[PDB]
């Protein structure tokens, strides 16, 4: 069993959708932003 | 133990000492007959990890096989067909030299059973092998719970059916995506995948 038939609805407001879009995204630009950290740490 | 030093030494074939050895030994064999009985393993660490034991019933055989490609027999290179099949001379042989070696000693000692074989030397003409064999009628073997399996009839001429370690290699017997074609056995797996299977109640 994983849960219960009914239970209180709690909506903190965060789109789910948009949570995915953003999660998809962080992974996408992850390496790139790490290359900007390498190239900006280097700054003499 | 001395076997572990033997092991590590043998991995330095280009070392001054091993090629002195390699050179003297390889002339000695080339003098002897192409198949000859060996008195004892010249690599008793190698033999012993491929299943050899120093008791009555265990035989070592030394054998020479010619090196190089397989010339495609055929009168004057004539092939009689499509040009894809016109090669005669870059054609390679699906078994290894070690397999020929096993097979020819095996027939020379029909009463023995081939257990395994290791490489011992080469020049430009021959590769040389020592082949380790067992007598399945010697009681020393027939008793012995570790070896008597070899005494069973499914193990007649293992060397000839590609069931020695070399046979299993070239037969391509390994687990993996790399072995799809040849693995449960090649010819057998083709047959499966090319059989049309119809049920009583057509599916």
């Amino acid at each position: 069993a994983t849960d219960v038939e009914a239970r209180a609805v709690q909506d903190n407001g965060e789109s789910a959708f948009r949570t995915l879009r953003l999660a998809r995204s962080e992974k996408k630009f992850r390496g790139i932003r790490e290359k900007r950290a390498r190239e900006k740490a280097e700054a003499e | 133990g001395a076997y572990k030093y033997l092991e590590e030494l043998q991995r330095k074939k280009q070392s001054d000492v091993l090629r002195f050895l390699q050179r003297v030994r390889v002339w000695e064999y080339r003098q002897k007959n192409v198949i000859h009985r060996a008195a004892r393993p010249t690599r008793p660490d190698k033999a012993r990890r491929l299943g050899y034991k120093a008791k009555q019933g265990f035989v070592i055989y030394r054998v020479r096989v010619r090196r190089g490609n397989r010339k495609r027999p055929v009168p004057k290179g004539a092939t009689y067909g499509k040009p894809t099949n016109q090669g005669v001379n870059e054609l390679k042989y699906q078994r290894s030299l070690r397999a020929t070696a096993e097979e020819r000693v095996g027939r020379r000692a029909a009463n023995l059973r081939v257990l395994n074989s290791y490489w011992v030397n080469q020049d430009s003409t021959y590769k040389y092998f020592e082949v380790i064999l067992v007598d399945p009628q010697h009681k020393a073997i027939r008793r012995d719970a570790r070896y008597n399996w070899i005494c069973d009839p499914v193990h007649k001429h293992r060397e000839a059916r590609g069931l020695t370690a070399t046979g299993k290699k070239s037969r391509g017997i390994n687990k993996g995506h790399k072995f799809n074609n040849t693995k449960a056995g090649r010819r057998k797996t083709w047959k499966r995948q090319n059989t049309l299977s119809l049920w009583r109640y057509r599916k």
Binding site: L20, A23, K27, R30 | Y5, E8, K12, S15, D16, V17
Partner: protein
């Protein structure tokens, strides 16, 4: 790890209460061992360097670790082993014909 608990993104996947199993010894299949160190060291000084290994250390002393690798890479299989082989040569050089 620790998984986000959603089905994309960085640590994608279900949060389960985790366990971390006892370590398997096969997994320590490469490991040294005092017995093998000894025998390999002994064998080495018994049997001494081999032809390509000699061409290798003179190539170092006379041309640097980069020409060394480039050749060692052809001689051996690959770049990685070439690395390992040069390093070993270095350590012959140092430990011996120095301190």
């Amino acid at each position: 790890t620790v998984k986000t608990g959603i089905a994309i993104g960085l640590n994608k996947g279900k949060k389960v209460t985790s366990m971390t199993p006892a370590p398997k010894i096969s997994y320590k299949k490469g490991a040294a061992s005092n017995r093998t160190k000894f025998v390999r060291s002994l064998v080495r000084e018994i049997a001494g360097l081999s032809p390509y290994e000699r061409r290798l250390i003179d190539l170092i002393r006379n041309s640097g670790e980069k020409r060394a690798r480039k050749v060692a890479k052809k001689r051996l299989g690959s770049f990685t082993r070439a690395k390992a082989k040069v390093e070993e040569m270095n350590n012959i050089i140092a430990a011996s014909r120095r301190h």
